[PDB]
Amino acid sequence: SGFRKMAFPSGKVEGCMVQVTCGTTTLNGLWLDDVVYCPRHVICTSEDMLNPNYEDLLIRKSNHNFLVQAGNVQLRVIGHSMQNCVLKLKVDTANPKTPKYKFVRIQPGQTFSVLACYNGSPSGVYQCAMRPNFTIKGSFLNGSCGSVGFNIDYDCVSFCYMHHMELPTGVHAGTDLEGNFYGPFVDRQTAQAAGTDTTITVNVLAWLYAAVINGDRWFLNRFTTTLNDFNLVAMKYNYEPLTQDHVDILGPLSAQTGIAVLDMCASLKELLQNGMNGRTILGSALLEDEFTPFDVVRQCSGVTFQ
Amino acid sequence: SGFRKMAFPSGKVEGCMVQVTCGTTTLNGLWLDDVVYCPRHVICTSEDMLNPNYEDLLIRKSNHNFLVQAGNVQLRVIGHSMQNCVLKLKVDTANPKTPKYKFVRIQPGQTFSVLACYNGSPSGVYQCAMRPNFTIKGSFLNGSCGSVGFNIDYDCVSFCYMHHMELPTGVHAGTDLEGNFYGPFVDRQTAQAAGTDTTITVNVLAWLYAAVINGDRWFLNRFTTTLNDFNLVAMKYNYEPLTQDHVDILGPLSAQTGIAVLDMCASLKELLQNGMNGRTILGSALLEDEFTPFDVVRQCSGVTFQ
Numbered sequence: 027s028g029f030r031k032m033a034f035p036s037g038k039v040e041g042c043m044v045q046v047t048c049g050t051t052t053l054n055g056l057w058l059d060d061v062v063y064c065p066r067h068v069i070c071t072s073e074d075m076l077n078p079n080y081e082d083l084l085i086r087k088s089n090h091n092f093l094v095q096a097g098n099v100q101l102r103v104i105g106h107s108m109q110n111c112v113l114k115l116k117v118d119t120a121n122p123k124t125p126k127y128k129f130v131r132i133q134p135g136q137t138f139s140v141l142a143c144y145n146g147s148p149s150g151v152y153q154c155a156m157r158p159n160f161t162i163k164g165s166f167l168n169g170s171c172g173s174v175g176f177n178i179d180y181d182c183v184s185f186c187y188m189h190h191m192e193l194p195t196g197v198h199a200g201t202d203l204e205g206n207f208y209g210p211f212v213d214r215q216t217a218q219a220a221g222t223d224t225t226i227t228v229n230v231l232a233w234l235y236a237a238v239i240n241g242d243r244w245f246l247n248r249f250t251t252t253l254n255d256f257n258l259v260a261m262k263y264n265y266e267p268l269t270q271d272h273v274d275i276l277g278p279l280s281a282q283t284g285i286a287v288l289d290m291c292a293s294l295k296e297l298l299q300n301g302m303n304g305r306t307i308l309g310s311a312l313l314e315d316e317f318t319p320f321d322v323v324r325q326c327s328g329v330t331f332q
Numbered sequence: 333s334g335f336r337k338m339a340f341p342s343g344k345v346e347g348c349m350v351q352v353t354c355g356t357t358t359l360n361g362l363w364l365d366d367v368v369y370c371p372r373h374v375i376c377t378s379e380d381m382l383n384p385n386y387e388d389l390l391i392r393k394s395n396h397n398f399l400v401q402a403g404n405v406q407l408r409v410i411g412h413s414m415q416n417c418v419l420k421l422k423v424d425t426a427n428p429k430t431p432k433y434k435f436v437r438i439q440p441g442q443t444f445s446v447l448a449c450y451n452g453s454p455s456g457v458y459q460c461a462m463r464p465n466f467t468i469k470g471s472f473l474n475g476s477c478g479s480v481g482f483n484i485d486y487d488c489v490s491f492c493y494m495h496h497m498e499l500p501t502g503v504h505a506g507t508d509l510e511g512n513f514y515g516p517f518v519d520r521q522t523a524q525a526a527g528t529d530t531t532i533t534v535n536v537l538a539w540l541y542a543a544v545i546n547g548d549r550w551f552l553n554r555f556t557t558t559l560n561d562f563n564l565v566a567m568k569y570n571y572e573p574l575t576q577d578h579v580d581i582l583g584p585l586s587a588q589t590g591i592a593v594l595d596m597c598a599s600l601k602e603l604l605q606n607g608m609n610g611r612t613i614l615g616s617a618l619l620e621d622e623f624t625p626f627d628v629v630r631q632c633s634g635v636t637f638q
């Protein structure tokens with residue numbers, strides 16, 4: 027038993043991280059087969075990042091302008107091209123550690139593992155959720171750009187995120203691996219800010235199921251409610267509406283605990299209206315929304331990966 | 333910026349995990365050079381685990397009784413011996429992925445990364461603290477025994493923990509890699525339970541410094557206090573006493589924020605006596621004690637590992 031915020035083993039991604047230096051900018055790249063993927067703003071300078079024309083900026087670059095280092099081994103760049111907000115640097119060596127992978131874009135509400143990196147060297151790993159406002163509450167310092175987010179399914183690494191920038195509230199914004207930003211953000215210096223967020227309702231319910239599975243039951247109750255009457259309370263507390271599909275997804279959890287989904291909603295209603303009255307749930311004094319139904323099932327059952 | 337509970341990259345440990353099967357017991361082992369380390373209760377059966385005599389149990393075993401599988405490759409056992417509560421299974425192949433490593437025993441208050449494993453296959457990674465009562469609040473299901481805890485310093489993996497069992501409150505107990513249990517626990521079936529815990533005071537202060545570094549300042553105040561008057565409040569709220577050495581360790585954090593250590597104590601005093609009044613710190617509604625001063629400095633500065 028136990029429930030902890032848990033990331034995927036990072037080893038398969040660690041073997042793909044490299045360092046990309048261009049000019050006086052250094053960041054991380056992702057080396058898969060004979061391509062290194064990195065944020066395009068590596069070609070920018072300090073005055074460029076005011077209103078750049080990345081298309082103009084890249085035509086003025088050379089292959090030899092890109093210093094790519096895999097550990098203490100230099101990689102020779104033999105081609106470059108831009109895909110939306112990422113660069114694709116073709117190198118003369120396929121990464122022998124290329125795992126099976128896919129480039130997948132995730133939905134707000136979904137989680138992934140972030141391998142934070144500096145100078146091509148992995149620093150730490152942690153779990154993140156894509157917020158409804160397409161930001162992520164990560165931990166990123168100067169030099170972390172190009173760190174990727176990912177999920178692992180058996181042996182296949184689905185890359186979903188590449189880090190680009192920090193917004194002024196301290197949250198983080200980036201792209202999928204095809205270079206398309208999550209949310210209404212751009213890789214140039216503007217006054218852009220996060221935008222209004224909401225609580226991921228289905229994840230809170232999944233986490234309440236994780237709690238019940240792990241012996242925290244004090245928030246349970248005999249009440250019930252309709253989906254409609256629940257969604258009126260959700261909208262008042264800035265929670266996302268709950269759909270019938272969310273109820274279906276919660277089915278396995280409901281059946282394992284014997285607590286019907288709408289019963290758990292009634293529990294969440296009371297939690298939202300009364301607070302916790304000094305108690306905790308899974309060691310938290312807040313309702314947690316960064317665990318998906320899949321995350322709970324995975325951890326309260328025990329899946330692995332080769 | 334940002335502050336998230338962050339584990340070390342797990343890749344170096346992933347390449348050491350294997351599966352050890354003996355009889356109808358299967359668990360994880362740690363393969364370093366030509367030795368596989370695993371919990372000794374792999375030699376036990378269901379009736380054995382009532383009051384075993386592991387010494388008697390092992391003399392009746394053969395090398396061929398131990399099925400060790402590294403991925404889809406079998407490892408041939410050529411010797412076995414017991415070190416306290418761990419087995420040492422000598423195999424005919426050195427692990428070519430053996431990182432530089434050390435076996436280190438940690439102190440309550442210190443943190444480490446756990447690579448949770450099932451059937452020799454890594455499942456997830458997360459950060460844990462050794463509680464004052466020598467338990468860890470982990471996430472462990474049937475088959476996770478032999479999963480290890482570790483820290484990484486540049487390229488060297490200091491293994492500190494090997495998982496053995498779950499206590500009835502849902503917390504976890506294990507050994508250092510020399511087979512010596514953390515705390516007053518045994519690898520046989522008794523009514524043993526966790527014992528009284530306390531809050532790691534120095535870690536809470538380090539986390540309050542992480543908050544200030546990240547822009548949460550509402551809990552700051554102009555008050556101060558003596559170390560003595562603080563320790564009277566700590567003892568009332570079941571906090572560990574704060575020593576002058578803890579103050580010294582907090583020096584770098586104090587100097588970077590400009591908040592003297594004893595000023596932060598005065599802030600913690602008020603937090604303990606008044607609560608948070610509906611506010612949060614680093615996204616928590618509780619005072620967090622599972623980040624060491626080193627963890628905060630590492631994350632609020634950005635160290636990496638090759």
Ligand SMILES: *[C@H](O)[C@H](C[C@@H]1CCNC1=O)NC(=O)[C@@H](NC(=O)OCc1ccccc1)[C@H](C)OC(C)(C)C
Pocket residue numbers: 053067070075166167168169170171172190191192193198212213214215216333
């Ligand atoms: C890339 O390594 C860098 C990562 C951020 C630095 C701090 N935390 C990060 O996530 N990205 C940038 O520096 C971008 N700018 C940016 O994040 O500005 C806000 C900021 C906050 C705190 C410290 C520094 C910066 C880049 C340079 O800017 C564009 C993406 C618009 C080109």
Ligand SMILES: *[C@H](O)[C@H](C[C@@H]1CCNC1=O)NC(=O)[C@@H](NC(=O)OCc1ccccc1)[C@H](C)OC(C)(C)C
Pocket residue numbers: 027359373376381472473474475476477478496497498499504518519520521522
């Ligand atoms: C080894 O894989 C196993 C891991 C625990 C199972 C559940 N969570 C764990 O951490 N260790 C054991 O099964 C030990 N017993 C034990 O933990 O009993 C309590 C328990 C709680 C919940 C589910 C199952 C068991 C071993 C078998 O017992 C001795 C170490 C005393 C021999």
